[PDB]
């Protein structure tokens, strides 16, 4: 239905050990499909999903060239902002960007993003109208002034409204069999005695995709989210995700509790009991 493409750039300086290192990864929804590392023996954009490998040599050459340009651009960035703030020569610094687009079920642009951060906090971002910049502070206003005088916003808006959307739809088509096919969670309940009086019921959801999922316990048919222990949704390493929720309950009362799971890959909510 609704989809997105996202790139994540990070450049990290290391004063005294050569130029800053630049790294990039690309995503369609929750699947990584490309990466770049400036430190690599031979720096190339590399595929990370089957459905882009088929892209021809011209595609890879271009991505690699832009990635090389980008790493130089960010090295200038780091050095320039260093000056704006007059930081010390010894410390390392980071410069981040994430950009991309969301499209609705009709395949039209829902919205575009292009946000930069310096040392882990907002620096400058392209506004939702894609025609103005929001600067987080004084240093950023300088950057903003330059981007305005060069009219870069227009270039960014063109990529996001055009290229970004067009290529997302293309990847979505080429990868439809994995990307447009939600994988239902395999769910189960484990049983862990704490004392003779208390036991832990833990509800697991395994091997699901996309990452978005709902998980919760009820007693006698209604909520008890307070007293619910969760973990953050985590990657299994094979492109699928994991999550569990747990509650400590009285011995001999396990049968009162139900676990409930909602996920795009299930037609209908699931309920489990011990």
């Amino acid at each position: 239905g609704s989809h997105s493409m996202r790139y994540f750039y990070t450049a990290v300086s290391r004063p005294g050990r050569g130029e800053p290192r630049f790294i990039a990864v690309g995503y369609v929804d929750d699947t990584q499909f490309v990466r770049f590392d400036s430190d690599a023996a031979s720096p190339r954009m590399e595929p990370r999903a089957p459905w882009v490998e088929q892209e021809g040599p011209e595609y890879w050459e271009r991505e690699t060239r832009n990635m090389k340009e980008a790493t130089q651009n960010f090295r200038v960035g780091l050095n320039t902002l260093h000056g704006y703030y007059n930081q010390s020569e010894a410390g390392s610094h980071t410069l981040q960007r994430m950009y991309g687009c969301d499209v609705g079920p009709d395949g039209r642009l829902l919205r575009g993003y292009r946000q930069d951060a310096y040392d882990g906090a907002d620096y400058i971002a392209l506004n939702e109208d894609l025609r103005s910049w929001t600067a987080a502070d004084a240093a950023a206003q300088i950057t903003r002034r330059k981007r305005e005088e060069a009219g870069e916003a227009e270039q960014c808006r063109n990529y996001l409204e055009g290229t970004c959307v067009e290529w997302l739809l293309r990847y979505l088509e080429n990868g439809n069999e994995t990307l447009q096919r939600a994988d239902a969670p395999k769910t189960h309940v484990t049983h862990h005695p704490i004392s003779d009086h208390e036991v832990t019921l833990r509800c697991w959801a395994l091997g699901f995709y996309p990452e978005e999922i709902s998980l919760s316990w009820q007693r006698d048919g209604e909520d008890v989210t307070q007293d619910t222990e969760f973990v953050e949704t985590r990657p299994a390493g094979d492109r699928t995700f994991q999550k569990w929720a747990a509650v400590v309950v009285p011995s001999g009362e396990e049968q009162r509790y139900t676990c409930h799971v909602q996920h795009e890959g299930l037609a209908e909510p699931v309920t489990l009991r011990w």
């Binding site: 790139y7 990039a24 690309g26 595609y59 271009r62 991505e63 832009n66 990635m67 340009e69 980008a70 130089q72 651009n73 200038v76 960035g77 320039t80 902002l81 950009y99 950057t143 330059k146 981007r147 060069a150 870069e152 960014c156 990529y159 290229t163 970004c164 290529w167």
Partner: peptide, 12 residues
């Protein structure tokens, strides 16, 4: 497909 950033390093 990534954006092209060529020759905009003076924008910082």
């Amino acid at each position: 497909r990534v954006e092209d950033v060529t020759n905009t390093a003076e924008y910082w």
